[PDB]
């Protein structure tokens, strides 16, 4: 038998029950998906800056 | 000796094998000169 097909009725109310909430920005964010050639060098760049300060 | 084989090539995009739009029997003439 034919039932209802689709609605977004009331789905905004549910989303806002526990709200829509901001994306929690982070200083020092991830490096996921950054040019590996850059990462490879940046690695040694910083082991350099690290071993420097001894 | 038959001369060297140089063949002209065409710049026309049209590739279908069909007469163009003006090539229609509509544009002939009834009693055109027809040397007798």
């Amino acid at each position: 038998a034919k039932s209802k097909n689709h609605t977004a009725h009331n789905q905004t109310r549910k989303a806002h029950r526990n709200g829509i909430k901001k994306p929690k920005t982070y200083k020092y964010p991830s490096l996921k998906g950054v040019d590996p050639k850059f990462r490879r060098n940046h690695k040694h760049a910083l082991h350099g800056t690290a071993k420097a300060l001894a | 000796l038959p001369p060297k084989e140089i063949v002209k090539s065409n710049t026309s995009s049209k590739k279908a094998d069909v007469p163009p739009p003006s090539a229609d029997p509509s544009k002939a003439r009834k009693n055109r000169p027809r040397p007798s």
């Binding site: - | 038959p2 001369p3 060297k4 063949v7 002209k8 094998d17 069909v18 007469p19 090539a23």
Partner: protein, 169 residues
């Protein structure tokens, strides 16, 4: 005011519309070949009509582009065949002109029935100096109206040379 509006012939193109392929064409091209000195160009059929008994891309015509002094030779060599007279039609309003002659043996060349006889379309395309702009690669430009070949100015050039006459109307 012309020190430089001095009309040349740019190309002369002969063309025999041999409405079929094979032997008849490869001999009608031989005709232009011992008329031109150059190797002529086979033209393929554009589409297929079958009233003219042809097929698309069938190699049904040959033509040849000849330029400069060698063009004046063949132009006059055929202008004789037409008694140095062609008509007030037969001139493009863009300045060029051409004519047709059957029985191509009236151009000096002998008969040799291993070919037979062919007709030719003569077309003479003309221009003043500095036609380069229209056909060079860099800075391709179009010529001023002051300078383009017109019809009235090119029949007068045709009368003035050759002692031709223009025709009715």
């Amino acid at each position: 005011q012309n020190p430089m509006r001095d009309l040349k012939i740019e190309k002369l193109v002969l063309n025999i519309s041999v409405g079929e392929s094979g032997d008849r064409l490869t001999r009608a091209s031989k005709v232009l070949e011992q008329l031109s000195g150059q190797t002529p160009v086979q033209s393929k059929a554009r589409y297929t009509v079958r009233t003219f008994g042809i097929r698309r891309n069938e190699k049904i015509a040959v033509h040849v582009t000849v330029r400069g002094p060698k063009a004046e030779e063949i132009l006059e060599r055929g202008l004789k065949v037409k008694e140095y007279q062609l008509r007030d039609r037969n001139f493009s309003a863009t300045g060029n002109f051409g004519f047709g002659i059957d029985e191509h043996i009236d151009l000096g060349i002998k008969y040799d029935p291993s070919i037979g006889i062919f007709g030719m379309d003569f077309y003479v395309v003309m221009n003043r100096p500095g036609a380069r702009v229209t056909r060079r690669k860099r800075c391709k430009g179009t010529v001023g109206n002051s300078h383009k070949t017109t019809k009235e100015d090119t029949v007068s050039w045709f009368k003035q040379k050759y002692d031709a006459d223009v025709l009715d109307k």
